Every structure is written in C-alpha cells, then in structure tokens.
Amino acid sequence: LGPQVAEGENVFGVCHIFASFNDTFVHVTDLSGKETICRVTGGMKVKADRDESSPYAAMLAAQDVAQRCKELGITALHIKLRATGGNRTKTPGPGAQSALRALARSGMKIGRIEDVTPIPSXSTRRKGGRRGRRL
RNA sequence: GACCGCGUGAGGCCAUGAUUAAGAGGGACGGCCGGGGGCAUUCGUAUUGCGCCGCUAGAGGUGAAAUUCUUGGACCGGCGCAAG
Length: 135
Description:
Elements: E1 12-19, E2 24-29, E3 36-38, H1 55-70, E4 76-82, H2 95-105, E5 109-115
Parallel strand pairs: 1-4, 4-5
Antiparallel strand pairs: 1-2, 2-3
Helix pairs in contact: 1-2
The protein binds one RNA strand through residues 14, 16, 18, 22-23, 25, 27, 29-30, 32-41, 43-44, 48-50, 85-87, 118-124, 135.
Organism: Homo sapiens
Keywords: Cytoplasm, Isopeptide bond, Nucleus, Phosphoprotein, Ribonucleoprotein, Ribosomal protein, Ubl conjugation
Subcellular location: Cytoplasm; Nucleus, Nucleolus
C-alpha cells in the first residue's frame, strides 16, 4: 500500500532523533511533522534501565523503524538531531550516532541532516542549586 | 589712597596704585565616548501550563534504583494560546 510513486522516485519522511543521556527516540513523521509514521523508543528494546540510552539499544530501535517505514513506502529521510536542550545539556546522547548509522545501513536513504535542539535565548534557572549537584 | 601746599571746598602731585597665571584647583567651551543612572517602550527563544491533532506503551530518574507519571493516552511529534 501507501503512496503510488514511480520507479526512480523516492518519498521523504522526517526522522526526529531525540537522544538524551537517559533514553533515545527514533520518531519518524511525514514531511509536515504532524502525522506519526512510526515511533520506536530505545527503552522499548531492553530490560534494565541502565541500557535505555546505550548505543546498542538505539541501534535495535533504529532497525525496527526503517522496517516499518519501508512497508509504508517511505524511501528516504530528513534527519533532525535533538539533545535535551533548554536549561539542560546540549550535546546529544550516546545513541545519537548509532541510530543514524543503523538507519543508513538498513536500506534507508538520507536527505538533509539538521539540529533542532531547544536553545534558550536567555533561560529559567537550572535544577541544581547553587553549589550544584555534588557527588 | 600717600604727599605737598592753599581757601569744609578748590588743587597739584605720586613712573599714581591690581605679582604671576602652578605638569594645584574650580568654572565655561568644543567635538566625542561608555553593559554609568532613572523613566517609558520593543523584542527574543526557552520553560511551564493549556487546547486540538497524530501515532503509540512505556516515560522519567540514577552509580544502580525507587518514589512519581501513564490505554482514562503518558512521553514523542505538529499547530495554537496563556503567564511569569
């Protein structure tokens, strides 16, 4: 099923890769970003909570996303990386690189790659305290 | 104002009398310069909340966890609003 597309033509979804230090999201939408095609989360594929954000868990999430997209006809993806952002960290998580590689290795093609991490033009105060999270 | 003379007057006379303008200071003036100050105004994302839509079973959190939040739809995505 899906869209009735020609031989050489490809169709684009947008893949939102949200990669925090606790968990990894491999959400795939349409081009408008409104219609979810498939969302598989990195903590859907493991048992321990410590392995939610491991790169092996983001790989398994990335494989079961592309398998779901190609049986809806989606051929290529624009990539949107995303860290936590805001007051929190701006570097994307450990499963950011391994999901993007595994998405490429499973017969899925790549459009643009962008960064849509929330960046405060300012910020409310962070959740640490003044002396700030000592351990 | 000293000084001499002369009728409270009319005089002479003094080279007649005011150091300088501080690499002290105050003040004027000139074109500037500055996250200085006060009042008003404008803007920016973000966060939180909220509506509505989409798909879902986990989300979150940590050294590891649990309290917590979720099929009544959480989290993630999209549009919109609100407030500080």
